[PDB]
C-alpha cells in the first residue's frame, strides 16, 4: 500500500513555522525551530517517528508472541528518539524502546527471547537503519 | 532533545488493534491489521513516518533557500511511503516527496538545484537510510 501525509513550512529556519498533517485523522501538528531543537510548544518530526516506531514494535511483538502460541492481552511500548546537534549536524542518534507486556502463560525467558528478536524484524526498525543505536528494555507485567 | 511517544496493542495480529499516542498533544491514532496492510479505517506507522519526513524536508528546504538569500514564503510537501510485504517481509521500499514552493526572487533552476541538495542532508532522511529509494519532485509556484 501507499500511505501519505503532508507538511507546510512558512518562512526561514529560525523564525518560520510549519504544520504536519494527517488530513484523514484530522491531525495538525505545529512545529517550529523552538519545538524541534529547544523545548518550545508544538511537536516535531522526531515525536512522530517515535510514535511510528512504538506502533510498529507493539504490533510486531504481539504478532511474534501469537506465533509462539501466546497472543498478548496487551503490549505497551514507549519510544524515545534522541536528537543531537552532532557532528555540526542534527542527527537521530539513539532510539530507546521500553515495553511492558501482559501475556498469559508465557515464561519470562521465552518472552524476552521473542522481544529481543522482534526489535530486529519489521518495516520501521529496518527503515531506520541510519540510527546508530536501538536499545530495548522489555518486561512482563 | 529526547522526544517521546507511545503505542498500545491488544490481542494478536489479525484480530487485535492498537493506538499510537503523542506526548506533546492529544492525538490518538488507531491502527489495525486492516488499516496497516489493507485499506481499513485507521492510521498506521507509515502515515506517521510520511508526516515526519514531509515535515523534515519542508523545514530543511526552507533553511537551504534562506542560506542562499531566498527564504520561502511557503514550502508544501506531500510524502508517499510505499509498504510492501516483500520479499517475504514487510518493508518500506520507496518514499516519494512532492514539493511546491512559493519563493520570492529565485529562478526555477536555482530552486531545483537547492531542493535536490536538501533532500539528502537532514536528520529524518539520514535516519531512514534503510529505505532503498527516496525520489523528489519539486516545483516553484
Automatic annotation (TrEMBL), chains A, B:
Gene3D superfamilies attached to this UniProt entry: 3.30.300.20
GO biological process: response to oxidative stress
GO terms for MF: peroxidase activity
Domain of life of the organism encoding this protein: Bacteria
InterPro entries: KH_dom-like_a/b, OsmC/Ohr_fam, OsmC/Ohrsf, OsmC_Ohr_Peroxiredoxin, Peroxiredoxin_OsmC
Record PTM Cysteine sulfinic acid (-SO2H), positions in chain: 56
Protein name per UniProt: Osmotically inducible protein C
Annotated gene: tthHB8IM
Amino acid at each position: 500500500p501507499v500511505r501519505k501525509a503532508k507538511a507546510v513550512w512558512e518562512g526561514g529556519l529560525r523564525q518560520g513555522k510549519g504544520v504536519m498533517e494527517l488530513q484523514s485523522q484530522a491531525f495538525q501538528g505545529p512545529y517550529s525551530y523552538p519545538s524541534r531543537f529547544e523545548e518550545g510548544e508544538g511537536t516535531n518530526p522526531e515525536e512522530l517517528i517515535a510514535a511510528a516506531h512504538a506502533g510498529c514494535f507493539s504490533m510486531a511483538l504481539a504478532a511474534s508472541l501469537e506465533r509462539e502460541g501466546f497472543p498478548p492481552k496487551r503490549v505497551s511500548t514507549e519510544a524515545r528518539v534522541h536528537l543531537e546537534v552532532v557532528d555540526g549536524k542534527p542527527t537521530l542518534t539513539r532510539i530507546e524502546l521500553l515495553t511492558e507486556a501482559e501475556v498469559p502463560g508465557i515464561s519470562s525467558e521465552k518472552f524476552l527471547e521473542i522481544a529481543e528478536a522482534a526489535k530486529e524484524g519489521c518495516p520501521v526498525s529496518r527503515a531506520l537503519a541510519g540510527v546508530k543505536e536501538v536499545v530495548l528494555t522489555a518486561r512482563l507485567v
